[PDB]
Design a protein around this ligand. Sequence first.
Ligand SMILES: O=P(O)(O)C(O)(Cc1cccnc1)P(=O)(O)O
Ligand SMILES: O=P(O)(O)C(O)(Cc1cccnc1)P(=O)(O)O
Ligand SMILES: [Mg+2]
Ligand SMILES: [Mg+2]
Ligand SMILES: [Mg+2]
Ligand SMILES: [Mg+2]
Ligand SMILES: [Mg+2]
Ligand SMILES: [Mg+2]
Lengths: 340, 340
Amino acid sequence: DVYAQEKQDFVQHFSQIVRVLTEDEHPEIGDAIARLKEVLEYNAIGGKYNRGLTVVVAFRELVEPRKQDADSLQRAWTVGWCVELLQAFFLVADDIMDSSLTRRGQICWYQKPGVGLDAINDANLLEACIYRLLKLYCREQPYYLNLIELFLQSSYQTEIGQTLDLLTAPQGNVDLVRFTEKRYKSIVKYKSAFYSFYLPIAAAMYMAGIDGEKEHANAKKILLEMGEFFQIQDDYLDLFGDPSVTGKIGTDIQDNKCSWLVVQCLQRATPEQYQILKENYGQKEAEKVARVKALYEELDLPAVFLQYEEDSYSHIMALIEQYAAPLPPAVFLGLARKIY
Amino acid sequence: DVYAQEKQDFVQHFSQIVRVLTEDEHPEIGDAIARLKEVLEYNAIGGKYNRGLTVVVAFRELVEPRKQDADSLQRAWTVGWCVELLQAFFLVADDIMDSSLTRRGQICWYQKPGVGLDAINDANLLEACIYRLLKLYCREQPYYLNLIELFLQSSYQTEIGQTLDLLTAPQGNVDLVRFTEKRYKSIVKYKSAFYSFYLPIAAAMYMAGIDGEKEHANAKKILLEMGEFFQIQDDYLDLFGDPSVTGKIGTDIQDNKCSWLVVQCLQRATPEQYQILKENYGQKEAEKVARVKALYEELDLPAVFLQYEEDSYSHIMALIEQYAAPLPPAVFLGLARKIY
Ligand SMILES: O=P(O)(O)C(O)(Cc1cccnc1)P(=O)(O)O
Ligand SMILES: O=P(O)(O)C(O)(Cc1cccnc1)P(=O)(O)O
Ligand SMILES: [Mg+2]
Ligand SMILES: [Mg+2]
Ligand SMILES: [Mg+2]
Ligand SMILES: [Mg+2]
Ligand SMILES: [Mg+2]
Ligand SMILES: [Mg+2]
């Protein structure tokens, strides 16, 4: 993959990211800078880096090789890491609010002895690092304000989606009537689709001088649909994924979430199955979670997911045929290969 | 006061702030927008509004009356509310991390039944509103990027200071050796001084076209010292203030904080008093907190605070004589009257 090709340089740039972000160590703040380094090392490293790498890959595909000078590539890697940092900020807070146990194969940052709710400020620091890096590397570039505004808008969208996620999933209060297809789509559009797929491609676009509203709207048409599929896959894997592969233990059932699985359950369930779901959803008891999983297996939801992935793939490819131009289709095809 | 004069118009502008921030209610996000309105109403309203009002007061003093058109004043009120929103974001998170009970006379947002750790995302939303308002009202102004960068830098500084605050105050781990005057000054400079006093005056300066590095450095010399005094007063009031007046219950002793009071205690304590402090600090027991307060009263720390306030006031006034020019001294004198 073009991603496998770009990764080494990308991952190697992290040591520079950390060095530059700890280099204004103002000796009086050194203890805080040491902490920031620990937060960065624990939370921004250990993933697949696909969102950050997308900035780098798309940049190479959209900027003419003659314009891909050493300093331009450095900026592209930096902006890719800003995308990973935004994700890091959101995940550290999300793990607290979802009462999660593990992430990327290790205990969630907030669960670490001695961290706890201090993680809230650590997450805010990750967010702050984005704008520090943008100033340090891109302040003199004509796309500087476009990138600042893109990251801020992306944060606002994600926060609105998180609000909807949490509102639809009140603890100890099970009302399955809330869990509709229309509600689901709205939640996932905001909480995941914007920052996961649109953000990195849009960043590369701005860096290539592609700032037109029409071009961004067309890219969105593809990328927001990709983001939706990806969140549906995340929901499926929450229950049916191998945590050795996913790196995280699922909490959606216990947490009373408007998951794609519960929505599809509700679409197919008989009145009797509905009551079983109602009596067992949103509760910490392992036996109750197990009855929900059994109901999902009884309704062939794994098979339903497999079909949906096939149909979604074909849909996004049709959307690439319609909306990719004038951008190289490879920009979208590479990302599609990576997520499906 | 000039503050009492400017308040009504300022507080009345909040209804417009909320209307504009809920006006992109995209009907699918309406539940989230209703929540945002609740967060705004609960957390941004009920204080004295001195930081926001400082933007408005300083704007009127720094911009020529002929340039204080209706739209310019609207922008100044909006930017004042952005300052209050930044404070709101920081306080909602701080109350979680400090395990606080009340704020502005009411239960802390996170302590409210049904809120809990969802407050983390609510706080992120408050932060996001700042940049929404700056775009909506100031995007076409020549100071737009200066304001974006000022608020982001202010957030980063505050987050670094919060990191130091929390690092120096580990729960259940009492080491009084950490609590030095040098450490204290560094903590408070970052966590409070920048956003509390420098931020609002600097915002008004940028809005008046006063963007020079020298002018900002000179204003900082006054304003960071004001911010330090104000945090020292906050620390004093944490234990000795009337919560009916302060609106909040103190937690510094229980929370093992590097408070100005503990630092001054350590400066005066005999070896015997040192052991009493050591045995009683950083613990939830009311009886232990009471022994610490008794030690502080025995060492005449209230009297020490009173003297420090007198000496600090005279110092900041000397700094105004040195550093105010070419700005009107009234800009600083009004703020000084408000805090001392
Ligand atoms: O990785 P997670 O926790 O499965 C998740 O995707 C993380 C996440 C956080 C914020 C926005 N979007 C996704 P969630 O939505 O909580 O299922
Ligand atoms: O209002 P509080 O909680 O007394 C405080 O001033 C709030 C605060 C939060 C963030 C930055 N600076 C002050 P703290 O430092 O926690 O004593
Ligand atoms: Mg989660
Ligand atoms: Mg979540
Ligand atoms: Mg998930
Ligand atoms: Mg506090
Ligand atoms: Mg605090
Ligand atoms: Mg305090």
